[PDB]
Amino acid sequence: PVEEYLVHALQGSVSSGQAHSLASLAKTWSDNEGVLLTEKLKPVDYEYREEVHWMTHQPRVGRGSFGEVHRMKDKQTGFQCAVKKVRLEVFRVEELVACAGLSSPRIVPLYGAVREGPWVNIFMELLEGGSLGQLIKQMGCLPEDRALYYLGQALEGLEYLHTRRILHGDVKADNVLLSSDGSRAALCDFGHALCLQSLLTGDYIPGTETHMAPEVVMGKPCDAKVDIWSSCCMMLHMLNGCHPWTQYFRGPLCLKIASEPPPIREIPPSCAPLTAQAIQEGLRKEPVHRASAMELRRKVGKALQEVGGLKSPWKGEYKEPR
Numbered sequence: 001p002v003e004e005y006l007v008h009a010l011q012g013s014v015s016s017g018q019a020h021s022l023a024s025l026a027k028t029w030s031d032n033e034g035v036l037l038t039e040k041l042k043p044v045d046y047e048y049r050e051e052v053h054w055m056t057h058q059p060r061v062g063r064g065s066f067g068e069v070h071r072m073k074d075k076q077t078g079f080q081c082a083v084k085k086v087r088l089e090v091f092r093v094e095e096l097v098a099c100a101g102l103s104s105p106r107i108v109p110l111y112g113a114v115r116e117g118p119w120v121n122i123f124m125e126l127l128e129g130g131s132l133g134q135l136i137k138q139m140g141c142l143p144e145d146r147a148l149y150y151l152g153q154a155l156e157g158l159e160y161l162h163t164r165r166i167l168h169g170d171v172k173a174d175n176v177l178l179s180s181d182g183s184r185a186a187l188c189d190f191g192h193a194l195c196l197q198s199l200l201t202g203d204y205i206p207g208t209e210t211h212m213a214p215e216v217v218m219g220k221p222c223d224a225k226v227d228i229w230s231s232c233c234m235m236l237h238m239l240n241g242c243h244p245w246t247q248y249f250r251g252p253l254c255l256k257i258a259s260e261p262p263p264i265r266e267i268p269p270s271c272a273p274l275t276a277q278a279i280q281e282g283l284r285k286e287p288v289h290r291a292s293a294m295e296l297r298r299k300v301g302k303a304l305q306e307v308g309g310l311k312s313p314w315k316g317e318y319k320e321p322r
């Protein structure tokens with residue numbers, strides 16, 4: 001009833017507010033409007049405009065797949081954080097409906113979103129350790145204890161997302177962000193997310209092909225289990241230093257994903273038996289037989305105990321990939 005009235009109050013200005021307001025407004029995104037969720041990102045006279053009220057840091061340094069994530073400062077408060085830029089014409093409402101209102105240590109905090117012309121600017125906490133995707137490139141591949149340790153947190157955030165019937169859509173190293181000392185890991189980027197009740201309908205952008213579950217490829221119906229397949233492709237990447245499939249096959253990868261057996265051949269043979277068995281359970285081609293988020297987190301927490309807890313230095317020494 002009053003619903004439609006509240007949306008109208010939000011349109012056309014930028015305000016301090018709360019996640020439910022941000023999602024109300026975000027649903028209308030298919031001049032300068034938006035809601036900021038934290039006291040250190042403040043609008044000025046109904047506006048929040050890039051280079052006026054917030055500046056990107058220095059010569060531009062991008063950091064996502066598309067170089068669309070930047071460091072930024074709020075000009076008035078001096079606060080710093082991260083912007084992801086999204087083209088308004090391709091903006092998926094779920095990128096903010098599916099994550100506004102969340103609160104979880106395993107999930108990157110959302111600071112707001114402001115539309116400004118053709119840009120949806122999405123603001124979040126800046127985590128200084130960078131992405132697990134970078135960590136892997138820097139260090140070659142990760143010690144088994146570290147890889148399990150991060151995989152467990154990733155599954156911890158997938159637990160949170162899943163029992164709220166949210167599917168992240170693109171679990172992968174590039175979307176886990178590490179704290180400054182490397183001890184805390186959090187999921188970012190909901191641009192592939194999907195609220196729950198085939199994936200190949202609607203505003204659907206597909207996720208990273210190498211981490212793509214077999215049901216996702218063959219068109220079949222999809223539930224939270226596709227995240228688990230991905231997290232284990234991520235695991236292999238952490239261990240081997242490269243994505244599954246990229247070695248053995250050259251052509252259109254999604255064809256091999258549906259015909260071939262799950263890529264457990266790529267599990268390092270020096271992994272303790274419970275590492276290997278857990279990677280296998282989250283890589284069952286049929287989502288019914290595949291482990292859930294809660295099962296695999298438990299299973300991985302114990303695999304971590306079996307190899308003596310986490311002992312490797314966070315930025316230890318380089319390790320040659322496969």
Ligand SMILES: CNC(=O)c1c(C(N)=O)nc2n1[C@H]1C[C@H](C1)c1cc(F)c(C#C[C@@](C)(O)c3cc(C)on3)cc1-2
Pocket residue numbers: 063064065069082084095099107108109110122123124125126127128129130131174175177187188189190191
């Ligand atoms: C040093 N760290 C970084 O450069 C950094 C930060 C950051 N926050 O510092 N974010 C990202 N990156 C790296 C990793 C790449 C670029 C990357 C890609 C993304 F699509 C996103 C995102 C996102 C959101 C806005 O959909 C989101 C929703 C909810 C909840 O949380 N986030 C962030 C980052």
